[PDB]
From a paper:
For the second pathway, we aimed to destabilize the putative R183-mediated backdoor using p.[name] and p.R183G mutations. [name]-R183G and [name]-[name] released Pi at slightly increased rates of, respectively, 0.0117 s−1 and 0.0190 s−1, corresponding to a 1.8- and 2.9-fold increase compared with wild-type β-[name]. In wild-type F-[name] structures, the R183 side chain interacts with D157 and the carboxyl moieties of S14 and I71. Interestingly, in F-[name]-[name], Mg2+ changes position so that it is directly coordinated by both α- and β-phosphates, as well as by four water molecules. Although R183 does not directly interact with ADP in wild-type F-[name], it resides in close proximity to the nucleotide and, importantly, it is positioned in a negatively charged cluster of acidic residues. Hence, F-[name]-[name] has a more negatively charged nucleotide-binding site, which may explain why the positively charged Mg2+ repositions in the mutant structure to compensate for the charge imbalance.
The release of inorganic phosphate (Pi) from [name] filaments constitutes a key step in their regulated turnover, which is fundamental to many cellular functions. Here, using human and bovine [name] isoforms, we combine cryo-EM with molecular-dynamics simulations and in vitro reconstitution to demonstrate how [name] releases Pi through a ‘molecular backdoor’. While constantly open at the barbed end, the backdoor is predominantly closed in filament-core subunits and opens only transiently through concerted amino acid rearrangements.
Numbering used by the authors:
A (entry chain A), B (entry chain C), C (entry chain E), D (entry chain D), E (entry chain B): 6 to 45, 49 to 371
Write the structure that this text describes.
Amino acid sequence: AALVVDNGSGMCKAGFAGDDAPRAVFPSIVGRPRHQGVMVQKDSYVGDEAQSKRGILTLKYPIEHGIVTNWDDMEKIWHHTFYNELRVAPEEHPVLLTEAPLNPKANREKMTQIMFETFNTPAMYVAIQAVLSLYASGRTTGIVMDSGDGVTHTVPIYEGYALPHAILRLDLAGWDLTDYLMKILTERGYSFTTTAEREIVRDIKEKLCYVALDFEQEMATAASSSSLEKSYELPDGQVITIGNERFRCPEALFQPSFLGMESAGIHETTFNSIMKCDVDIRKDLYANTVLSGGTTMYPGIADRMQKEITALAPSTMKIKIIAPPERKYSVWIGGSILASLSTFQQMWISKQEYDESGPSIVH
Amino acid sequence: AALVVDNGSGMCKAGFAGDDAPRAVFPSIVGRPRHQGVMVQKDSYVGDEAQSKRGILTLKYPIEHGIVTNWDDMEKIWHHTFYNELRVAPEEHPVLLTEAPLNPKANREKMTQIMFETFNTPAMYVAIQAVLSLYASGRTTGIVMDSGDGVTHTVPIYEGYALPHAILRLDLAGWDLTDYLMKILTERGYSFTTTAEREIVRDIKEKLCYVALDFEQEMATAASSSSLEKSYELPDGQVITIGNERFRCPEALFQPSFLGMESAGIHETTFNSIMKCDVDIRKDLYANTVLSGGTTMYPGIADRMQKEITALAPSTMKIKIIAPPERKYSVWIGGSILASLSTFQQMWISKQEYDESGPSIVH
Amino acid sequence: AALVVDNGSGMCKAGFAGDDAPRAVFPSIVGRPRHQGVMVQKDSYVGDEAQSKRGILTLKYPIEHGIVTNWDDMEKIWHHTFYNELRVAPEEHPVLLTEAPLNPKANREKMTQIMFETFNTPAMYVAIQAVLSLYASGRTTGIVMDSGDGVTHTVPIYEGYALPHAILRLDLAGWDLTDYLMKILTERGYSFTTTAEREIVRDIKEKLCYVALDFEQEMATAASSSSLEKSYELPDGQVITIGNERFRCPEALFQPSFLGMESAGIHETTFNSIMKCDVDIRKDLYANTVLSGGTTMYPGIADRMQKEITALAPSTMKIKIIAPPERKYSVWIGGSILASLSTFQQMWISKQEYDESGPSIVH
Amino acid sequence: AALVVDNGSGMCKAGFAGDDAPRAVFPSIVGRPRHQGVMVQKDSYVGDEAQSKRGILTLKYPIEHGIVTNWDDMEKIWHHTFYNELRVAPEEHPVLLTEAPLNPKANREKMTQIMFETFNTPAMYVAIQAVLSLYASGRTTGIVMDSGDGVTHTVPIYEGYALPHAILRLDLAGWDLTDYLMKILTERGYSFTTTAEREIVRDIKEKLCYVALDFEQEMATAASSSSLEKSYELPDGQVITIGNERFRCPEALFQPSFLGMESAGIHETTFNSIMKCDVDIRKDLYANTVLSGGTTMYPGIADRMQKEITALAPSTMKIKIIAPPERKYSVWIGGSILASLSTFQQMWISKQEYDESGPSIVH
Amino acid sequence: AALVVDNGSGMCKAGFAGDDAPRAVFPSIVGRPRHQGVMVQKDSYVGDEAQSKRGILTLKYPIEHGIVTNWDDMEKIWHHTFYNELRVAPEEHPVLLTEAPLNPKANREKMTQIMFETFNTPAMYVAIQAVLSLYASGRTTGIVMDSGDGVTHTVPIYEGYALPHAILRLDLAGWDLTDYLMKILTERGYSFTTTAEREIVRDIKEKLCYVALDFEQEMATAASSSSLEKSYELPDGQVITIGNERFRCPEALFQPSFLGMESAGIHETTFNSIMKCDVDIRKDLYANTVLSGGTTMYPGIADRMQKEITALAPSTMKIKIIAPPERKYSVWIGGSILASLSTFQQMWISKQEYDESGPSIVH
Ligand SMILES: Nc1ncnc2c1ncn2[C@@H]1O[C@H](COP(=O)(O)OP(=O)(O)O)[C@@H](O)[C@H]1O
Ligand SMILES: Nc1ncnc2c1ncn2[C@@H]1O[C@H](COP(=O)(O)OP(=O)(O)O)[C@@H](O)[C@H]1O
Ligand SMILES: Nc1ncnc2c1ncn2[C@@H]1O[C@H](COP(=O)(O)OP(=O)(O)O)[C@@H](O)[C@H]1O
Ligand SMILES: Nc1ncnc2c1ncn2[C@@H]1O[C@H](COP(=O)(O)OP(=O)(O)O)[C@@H](O)[C@H]1O
Ligand SMILES: Nc1ncnc2c1ncn2[C@@H]1O[C@H](COP(=O)(O)OP(=O)(O)O)[C@@H](O)[C@H]1O
Ligand SMILES: [Mg+2]
Ligand SMILES: [Mg+2]
Ligand SMILES: [Mg+2]
Ligand SMILES: [Mg+2]
Ligand SMILES: [Mg+2]
């Protein structure tokens, strides 16, 4: 059985091909102690180990905006994934990895060198994340907008053919929303600064934030009452209350100028990607807009995306946003489907092909 | 039963001799994918298959101006015609094919070699398209002006005898009108460039274009109001509006200088063909001018042809333009009549005659 | 009832003895197609059939200058005459044929062999055409000037006796006038060249040409005004206008030098024929000059003949030109009278006399 | 010195009487621009000027089949001839013009009106072209077959006397052969349609076409090998190859049915012209058959004419075809000889005789 | 003195007629602040002002693909051109403007309305850009391939006459190459996204990119060494290094499939434009292929164009690419020559003609 590892910027999702859900889901973090030990202790902690001891750790993400910036810590996470989470020998199973489009070429080549020389996997393959999300929905036509912690990208596919010239990629994703929520929480006097407190803000974001259907009407509602106020208990028992920050944080996905970015929102990025495609396939892309990733899990984002794209598209087009309830695992689920196909078993890059063609075989 | 295949530049019309209408009518196109497949797909698409997937295809016509330029794609269309459209075994039926006059000799010889060596037809015959159109109208005397996608030709026939020295042929037909409509649509800011968008312009031409009775009076009407403006919805919901382009495009049939051509219009070509005939038969040709082909399906072309030929012919002649409502299928209908005649069953070129006389038997 | 067939160079006039007019009058032509048939058609056309389809035919006269030059086509005309025009069985009726004087001996012998061996007529007789014209006028004394399409001949007869030494024959007739009209029509830019266009010129000649009383005065009248101009509409609606060609064409009958001929005009030929007769019978020939044939049907030819012969004859002679209005059929009418006489029934050449005396019985 | 202008349908040959060759030889064409000028250009081009710029011009011949159809363009060619080519004042020299026999009377009268009222020539004369060709050969007896671009005519002359009744004229000449070569070049896929491309086909005809001695044997030779194939480089570097079209095009001179014409070939036209002459002069005409004009410049036409006339003439006659190597200029050379004769100086039509006798003096 | 304004998609080149170089050359951009001012600042910046402050601006091009999309910003650029750059009163000088062929009709009419109603110019004229480039080279015959930031178009001209039916236009130009360089720079981890960073990529393109003579040989050279690597210092001191991207970016001009476009390269577009012209003028167009515009300023593009057209043209044609070193200003230089011609002073459209004929006078 093949191993499917979906390693975006924020999470590591691993499991076996053929299953319907990842077996191991943990944060893609490496924590190191920032104090002195006095008791007569591991040197570093990975994943949920680092998340539970984060009070005395400095947390580091080895992947930033889809790109591995620390390859030593990236091997710790893969080692922790294989031996501690899945508890398998990686030299016995082919590994299917994922990657965002328009990534540096050296990123995929280093992933290949590590899988073949450090873990000694027999076969290997690197797929595009948005393509796997279309496998998960059981479609061959559609435009996938995948947004995780580091990357947001749109990939249009028609009848199984990708339109690579129409692929768009934004560096605006979940990390920027957490960073923005930290900034607007200072307006109420809540100061979060350390890497451990950044994990608390992300937990606040995932539990209290939502997408407003009309932002200006929602701002006027929050300024005239308190029906939108929600409380949240910090780990030390302190209770914070947030109001319009609940929908102002996800609003940066549609108005990136809140972050000082010049780019377009996720609705205009999806529309611009459709408009780069041929006129004859746009009608099918409008009706098969698929959301994927953890950053699409805000309540009300599918209704907001449909409203915003309807205002950009011609009035005779049928805008249909497909947001399955399991779309946080769509990349992994689609990778599990792909690695189980019989027509895919010739797509593997074996270790022999890597020894005779070098790392350039992965491109 | 014999097979009747009318394969002009634009369309493929196929059926069985004795029927009153073709059973298979599809565009004579071969589409190949111009992108990369990412889903784990045929290598080429023919006819209506290529027309529905044209968003991701490069469309190619194997016949250009009546002459087959790609014999590999021409066999794909004939193979698609026999096995997918008609669903017959071509080695059991004689095949009646059509061809424009004044074509290269090697074009008809290659059609004969393919029908006998690739499809193994028992018998075969290649007829002239304008002659078949006269069978469809139930006449033995008349001048047929047939205009399709690639070729416009006039063939005068008197009492069953053809006047080959009076046959005229123009390379101005439906393809040049579509190409001209694409050019004058840029005046309103509508840009069509790809082969898929050329199919959209042809659809615009067939639905909105018409022949003006007086061109200069029609130009003054369109410049003073908007009663001639029509809208058209593109496949992606965008709506374009055209005014004088509706009659300026078909006007190139009567004024080929709009295309930069030096040749004469279809009215002067018909008149020059009559004037090459003997003086004693011109009166019968004037009264039996038969229109045929898809390019004669513009509204108002019969009234315009009659007006233009009346101005060229002597005032005592009776100009009568015969434009039947089914004249888009006249070549096929006439071929179905001819292949069903008992006096035609000796005109077939059997495979034995082809083996003993070579490909020169077809001439 | 006997059959009377008057077959000159141009026309075939057939009917039954006793009638006052021929029942069948058609051009003595055989037309064959000069193009290729494409419609899935007789091999040749005779008479009015060839005249109506002459646009696609090559027209041939089997009789040239009174002499049959094509005996295969001559049988087609006789076959068409008996079975299609008269609709009789020629093996039941005696046939009276006509011939110009001073013809080759083999011409009359071949007519006899065909009538007895091909059509199996019971009896047969060949008469001289000018002698029959004198029967038609009810005279026994007179000089007959018969002019058709091929031959002009004068035969003087006195009290029922022919003067064979005074018979004159000219090869100047209607064919040469049509040929001359074609030549002088080029002066106005009218080009007639084909055998079908020669039939049009002959129609122009029969409708617009006339004999001028004084040629030089008529030439001066046409050169000073336009009262002599007449229009004529061609079969294709084109209108031609002719002036002095109307009387210049028939003037060749009186001045054969217009045709490059050295012979004398029809007036001097008639006078020379009278002067070869005995002095005692010339006075009766001067008073009984009978015109006959289609070439004598020009308006004003009787007044011109009288004026020209009066200038040649002594001033005390009474010149009387007899030009009956039915003189185009005089040979046939006279043959119908002769074949009905009871004293003629012993002049027939029966088939028994032909079998025992050979073809020399006809001379 | 008198000016000699030989202006047939295709070429204009001009010079001075007494010289042995024309000084100016250029195509009788007038070209007008068929596009729009954008550079900040003459309105029309004549002769070699139009031939070099023919890519952007519509070429028109003012003379068609020996008859001037455009008198405005005919004056442009004469004006270009006098002032640009010969560089003389036409009001100082008498002009000798040429004309085909059996031309419309108004054609010669308009040439006289233009020479006297537009160019103000002192004297003028219009000669028959075939008569001048006999001066060029130094003969007083012979039949001249002159064939140019528009007209083919035969004029028999005996001891200095013309036989006008034996003059024959065909409208089959070089223009019809070029038009026929264009038609049979489509059999190999070579499409020439514009007036500029017609000049290219004429160049192909003059360089590659020849007359086959036996046509059926030559057709069998070309169908069994490739020794008759010749290549020709088009102006744009494209190379075309022609085989049996090299001798099929000139074969229309001997079999006009290839053009759909009913007329006889040039061999039968020459023979029919001799047979219209008196029996006593035919022997001298058989031995002095003179070829003239550009259409007689095909290799092998003299040997073919001799073979074809020998088969028509009695076996005891000596058929001698005189084809001088300079017979393309025979009409001009003979006109230069005639205009230099002292016994011709009274044949000029002075401007005084034209003012007192009108335009009818030229006939 | 007349004003010459060459305003393509990317640059604005302005000056006075008669000069040899534009006086004002600045980017055709309008920048607006995308932040909040806190210092107690113009509302928008044009040209070099916007280019120097682009760090805090959003840069907008009012002309996209040759078509003005923002007429308010287009007036800001013209106002900045007249009053700030040239420092003249536009109501005193006639203005010569430029435009790409096959542009929307309303684009030229709005330019005319603004020049006459907003700037009150006395006279005005709009020329075609490729025609002006032929004035700059001192030629009247040649095919001009002009490529700027928005449009690539070929205009063949022969002897001063344009062939409008042979004009081709591509929407592939400098903007698409900059956009493509941004995409392939992500392969090395260089992320440029904002409109200010797009100006940096364009600067990289103009300094480091070149056209490879053989693309596949150049790709193999770059993959085997580092002799093609060049460094570039960003505005903030960061140094980027690019290898095969130097010639892969300009290669999209010859292989537009790199951009996902179906169209043909600039070499095949030039060849197809020549092949639409008459056969007689193609030889002169092959020898006078003129390059123009900023997108033709890549090193090695003239040698590559000659190599690619030589492979398409017949081997006997002489392909000569004329690439003057000042061809970035050819449109302006040619407009300066045209506006100084005395024969052009009647081509101006005065303000009186605009008031009496409306905006339709410009077409
Ligand atoms: N219920 C939720 N609501 C909003 N955001 C969420 C939710 N769950 C996860 N996220 C965000 O999704 C991001 C990561 O999503 P995911 O696609 O699973 O990870 P990866 O970046 O590895 O692809 C994180 O930044 C996280 O804050
Ligand atoms: N209703 C219509 N009006 C105008 N043009 C038409 C119409 N229908 C078809 N055509 C044109 O006719 C051309 C082909 O006609 P047809 O004779 O059926 O094909 P073929 O070229 O195979 O003979 C096409 O170019 C098409 O644009
Ligand atoms: N009305 C007419 N006027 C002048 N010529 C005529 C007229 N009718 C007939 N002809 C001429 O008479 C010729 C034949 O006359 P006819 O004697 O009837 O024929 P055939 O030659 O058979 O004896 C034809 O050449 C025809 O042109
Ligand atoms: N060498 C040649 N071979 C065959 N045909 C020729 C040759 N030279 C000229 N011709 C033809 O002769 C025709 C004109 O001949 P010419 O008698 O010189 O002109 P015109 O028609 O003015 O009398 C043209 O149609 C041309 O094609
Ligand atoms: N040296 C150079 N090398 C390559 N490209 C250049 C160079 N200089 C300018 N360009 C490109 O030319 C384009 C504009 O050229 P130009 O014709 O001057 O402008 P316009 O679009 O106004 O006609 C820009 O996209 C620019 O990137
Ligand atoms: Mg994800
Ligand atoms: Mg058709
Ligand atoms: Mg008669
Ligand atoms: Mg000549
Ligand atoms: Mg430019």
